[PDB]
Amino acid sequence: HKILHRLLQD
Amino acid sequence: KILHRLLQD
Amino acid sequence: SLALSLTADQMVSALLDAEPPILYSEYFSEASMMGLLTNLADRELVHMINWAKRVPGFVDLTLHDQVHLLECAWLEILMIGLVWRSMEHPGKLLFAPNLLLDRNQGKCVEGMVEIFDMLLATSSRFRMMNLQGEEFVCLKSIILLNSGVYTFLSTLKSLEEKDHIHRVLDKITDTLIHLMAKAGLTLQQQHQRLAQLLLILSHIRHMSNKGMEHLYSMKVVPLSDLLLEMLDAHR
Amino acid sequence: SLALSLTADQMVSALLDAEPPILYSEYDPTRPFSEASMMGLLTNLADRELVHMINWAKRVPGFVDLTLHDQVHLLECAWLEILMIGLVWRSMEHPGKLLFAPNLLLDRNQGKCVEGMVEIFDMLLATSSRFRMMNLQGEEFVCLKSIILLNSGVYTLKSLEEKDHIHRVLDKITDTLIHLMAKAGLTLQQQHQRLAQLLLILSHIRHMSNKGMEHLYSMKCKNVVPLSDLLLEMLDAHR
Ligand SMILES: Oc1ccc(-c2ccc(-c3ccc(O)cc3Cl)s2)c(Cl)c1
Ligand SMILES: Oc1ccc(-c2ccc(-c3ccc(O)cc3Cl)s2)c(Cl)c1
Numbered sequence: 331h332k333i334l335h336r337l338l339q340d
Numbered sequence: 341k342i343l344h345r346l347l348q349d
Numbered sequence: 350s351l352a353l354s355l356t357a358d359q360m361v362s363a364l365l366d367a368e369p370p371i372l373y374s375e376y377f378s379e380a381s382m383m384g385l386l387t388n389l390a391d392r393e394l395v396h397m398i399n400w401a402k403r404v405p406g407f408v409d410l411t412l413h414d415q416v417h418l419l420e421c422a423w424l425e426i427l428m429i430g431l432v433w434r435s436m437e438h439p440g441k442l443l444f445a446p447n448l449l450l451d452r453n454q455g456k457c458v459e460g461m462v463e464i465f466d467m468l469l470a471t472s473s474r475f476r477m478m479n480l481q482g483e484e485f486v487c488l489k490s491i492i493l494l495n496s497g498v499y500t501f502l503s504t505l506k507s508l509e510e511k512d513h514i515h516r517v518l519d520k521i522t523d524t525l526i527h528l529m530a531k532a533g534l535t536l537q538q539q540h541q542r543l544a545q546l547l548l549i550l551s552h553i554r555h556m557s558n559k560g561m562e563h564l565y566s567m568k569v570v571p572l573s574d575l576l577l578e579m580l581d582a583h584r
Numbered sequence: 585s586l587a588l589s590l591t592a593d594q595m596v597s598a599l600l601d602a603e604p605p606i607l608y609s610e611y612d613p614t615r616p617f618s619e620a621s622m623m624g625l626l627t628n629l630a631d632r633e634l635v636h637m638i639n640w641a642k643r644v645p646g647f648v649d650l651t652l653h654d655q656v657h658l659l660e661c662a663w664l665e666i667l668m669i670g671l672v673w674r675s676m677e678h679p680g681k682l683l684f685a686p687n688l689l690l691d692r693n694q695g696k697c698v699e700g701m702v703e704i705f706d707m708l709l710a711t712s713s714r715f716r717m718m719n720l721q722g723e724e725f726v727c728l729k730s731i732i733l734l735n736s737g738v739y740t741l742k743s744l745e746e747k748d749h750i751h752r753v754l755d756k757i758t759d760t761l762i763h764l765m766a767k768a769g770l771t772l773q774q775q776h777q778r779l780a781q782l783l784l785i786l787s788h789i790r791h792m793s794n795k796g797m798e799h800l801y802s803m804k805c806k807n808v809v810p811l812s813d814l815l816l817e818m819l820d821a822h823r
């Protein structure tokens with residue numbers, strides 16, 4: 331997925 | 341410019 | 350300046366009386382549709398200039414400053430007008446009484462289907478808020494005075510100009526509040542609705558900026574000399 | 585949502601504590617600027633700020649109530665606006681200059697080598713001069729920045745009641761702004777005028793962002809400076 335979509339969890 | 345002319349008229 | 354001396358009702362009346370007429374499209378392919386929109390916009394521009402000169406405080410400005418404001422805001426003003434008269438037509442844009450388009454028709458040209466959806470969303474928002482005509486003319490006047498007031502310029506005369514615009518802008522804000530208070534809205538509701546209306550101008554700004562891009566890359570098949578000059582102001 | 589139960593002071597305190605740190609640039613004073621090197625500094629700085637922005641966004645009342653897809657969209661739309669208003673805010677006490685970083689304080693002449701930088705620079709300076717003239721307060725600033733996050737991408741099925749949720753939070757920040765101005769001692773009339781003044785500036789911040797995207801993508805299409813994949817994806821979102 332998008333890096334942004336990944337960072338909004340971690 | 342045209343806008344100048346139109347603003348005066 | 351008479352603009353600062355006007356009352357709230359007088360401000361409304363002046364703006365309502367200054368409203369431009371609704372023009373018709375002299376009236377597709379991937380050229381016919383584009384031509385209709387640009388020809389329409391060009392003819393509306395002529396009437397927009399008359400309207401601008403009737404906006405309280407605008408004639409107090411220098412010709413150079415009047416030019417700058419119109420060059421910056423002309424597409425914004427066209428869009429909010431389009432959005433306004435498209436309010437009662439959900440999922441449709443009323444460019445002209447004989448030119449009512451849906452989003453599928455807007456696909457017939459380059460890169461407008463995105464802009465088309467944003468205009469529809471803005472129209473839906475106004476419909477949701479039940480935007481009133483007296484509020485609409487206030488917003489459009491705000492756009493004219495605000496949109497290019499930060500790209501002005503030192504030269505204390507210029508600071509005097511920008512300060513005059515801010516006083517007129519505060520006046521229009523007072524007018525908006527006056528309209529809401531007249532509608533029976535509480536103090537809290539007035540502030541909230543005022544905020545809601547002005548945040549939409551940010552989206553109108555956005556639509557214009559994206560619109561400037563496409564029309565600039567479409568400049569091929571015919572734009573008028575005036576429209577060409579208006580476009581070269583954003584480049 | 586719990587965000588709607590927050591008072592004005594609770595709203596203010598939450599936003600203040602959620603504030604991201606002021607980061608330093610990798611500025612090297614041993615060498616002169618080039619278009620590539622200057623863009624290198626700015627994009628490297630922006631990228632490191634993005635990580636902090638994402639966490640700040642999570643701490644903005646009502647934001648985590650949204651779906652991940654909605655959170656992505658809002659940040660994709662407003663990230664440059666948020667970077668700019670922060671830049672403008674910390675440049676307030678520096679007339680004629682922009683404080684990108686404590687070790688990167690520039691004037692309009694220093695970035696003439698960068699494509700389209702001077703244009704954006706002047707607009708940023710004008711915004712900074714406006715905030716300074718209006719004596720913008722820190723509590724007002726964090727409200728405006730949160731508004732940008734929630735508003736900028738709100739107009740782009742079932743979850744239309746979450747669009748309702750965004751507007752309710754936006755209404756809360758409006759109440760908060762008024763509450764601040766009243767606390768500051770402004771008259772009732774001065775409150776709705778200042779509110780209008782502050783929000784109209786957002787229209788210009790939006791304008792600067794869009795012009796910024798136009799230049800950034802252009803340089804990206806010229807391979808001026810290597811961008812992080814995150815920054816590439818943020819740019820492609822506007823394309
Ligand atoms: O009252 C009007 C009349 C014309 C227009 C338009 C004229 C040209 C437009 C256009 C066309 C294609 C495109 O890609 C982008 C735009 Cl903004 S839209 C508008 Cl927004 C309001
Ligand atoms: O906290 C920050 C960090 C970086 C930037 C910028 C990053 C890239 C910029 C740039 C440079 C040249 C240009 O033409 C346009 C832009 Cl947006 S500005 C900003 Cl506005 C705030």
